[PDB]
Design a protein around this nucleic acid. Structure first.
Length: 404
RNA sequence: CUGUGAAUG
């Protein structure tokens, strides 16, 4: 810290701005707190002019402060003041700030601190200028690195949240490329980007404000991304991170038409295998909970009768799943769904049929199996829940098998 | 006999 300031209580902001030493204060733990308090006061027109010039008016200083642990806060603060100061330099200032960021977009996105300057600009700038920042995003392998970066992934998520889809449609098609989807989806941060894109592309209650034309644009982008997801959903559903994306599609009511596509193309005929997977068993659970009734019947039939019992012991698919360390959560789900249906906590009407009598059949199968195996089941936390679940109803009312 | 997901003072 410069010696002429040592920090005196009578230090004024104008002193700091006039001295040429603002960069010294801005990168200093104590000096930045002074500037943070100062710029919150009633600034004269010239004080603002000096701040605009010295904080967001000089490209190299702007980058040094934006990439600084303390200076990035001063940058965001001055950006806010510049956007709130509607003088005759307003248009020029915002244009220059867009140019500074655009010219260093990728490096700023990857920086722990400068990515906060990006996000604050995206949501605070006038929409027309914020859309220009989005155009400065890269389109090659650097975009993959941005989506899987611990910092830069939040830049993409911010774009998706505050910028209309027309501006970032290239990101949807970039992610949907089979080679790119595999890399991004199986990453801890990339999977958050994909899930955030899917939610923004959903016609849920947070998109009812869209015009018809923007709804059509959203629907077409959703269909392109859903095609790539459902094309490698088996790989996605078993992955430690991408299984959350499959769960989200299967469980979200506003993605109903895709839940049936995912179930039929990925989970059907693989329920026994996927029920024994650490990550995919959660997907199977969601599918049972949310499947349409016509499909749920096929899923139940696959568990009860889709596999040939073991030729030596007679162990069948239900026995494997009911006692498996992950499969038991699927069987519990099946039992809970049936008990909810017969007790009235779940409706049973679909497609012109009443499937009440079908839930009765599945419950009777499960009750009969649980009754016969009650002694083995009573050893386990899962078995005790299943027994308890059936008792509450009476009061009120990886090994593979040969598939069929 | 219980079973998995984000980066600044």
């Amino acid at each position: 810290l410069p010696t002429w300031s040592l920090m005196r209580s009578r230090l004024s902001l104008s002193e700091v701005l006039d001295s040429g030493d603002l960069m010294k204060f801005a990168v200093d733990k104590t000096g930045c707190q002074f500037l943070e308090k100062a710029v919150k006061g009633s600034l004269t027109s010239y004080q603002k002019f000096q701040l605009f010039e010295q904080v967001i008016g000089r490209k190299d200083d702007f980058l040094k402060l934006s990439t600084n642990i303390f200076g990035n806060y001063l940058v965001q603060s001055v950006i806010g003041i510049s956007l709130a100061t509607n003088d005759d330099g307003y248009t020029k200032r915002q244009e220059k700030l867009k140019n500074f960021i655009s010219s260093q977009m990728t490096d700023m996105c990857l920086d722990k601190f400068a990515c906060r300057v990006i996000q604050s600009s995206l949501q605070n700038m006038d929409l027309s200028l914020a859309c220009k920042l989005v155009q400065a995003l890269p389109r090659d392998a650097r975009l993959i690195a941005i989506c899987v970066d611990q910092n830069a992934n939040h830049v993409i998520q911010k774009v998706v949240a505050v910028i209309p889809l027309k501006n970032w449609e290239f990101i949807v098609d970039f992610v949907a490329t089979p080679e790119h989807l595999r890399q991004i989806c199986s990453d801890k941060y990339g999977c958050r980007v994909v899930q955030t894109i899917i939610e923004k592309l959903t016609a849920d209650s947070m998109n009812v404000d869209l015009t018809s034309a923007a709804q059509n644009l959203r629907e077409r982008a959703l269909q392109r991304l859903m095609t790539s997801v459902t094309n490698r959903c088996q790989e996605l559903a078993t992955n430690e991170y991408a299984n959350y994306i499959i769960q989200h599609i299967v469980s979200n009511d506003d993605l109903a038409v895709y839940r049936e596509c995912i179930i039929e193309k990925c989970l059907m005929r693989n329920l026994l295998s996927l029920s024994q997977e650490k990550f995919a068993s959660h997907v199977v659970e969601k599918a049972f909970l949310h499947a349409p009734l016509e499909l749920l019947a096929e899923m139940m039939d696959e568990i009860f009768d889709g596999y040939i019992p073991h030729p030596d012991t007679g162990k069948d698919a239900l026995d494997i799943m009911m006692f498996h360390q992950f499969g038991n959560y699927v069987v519990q789900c099946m039992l809970t769904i049936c008990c909810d249906a017969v007790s009235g906590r779940r409706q049973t009407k679909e497609g012109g049929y009443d499937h009440a009598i079908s839930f009765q059949d599945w419950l009777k199968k499960l009750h009969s199996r649980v009754t016969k195996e009650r002694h083995r089941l009573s050893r386990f936390s899962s078995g005790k829940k299943m027994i308890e679940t059936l008792a509450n109803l009476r009061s009120t009312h990886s090994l593979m098998l040969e598939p069929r």
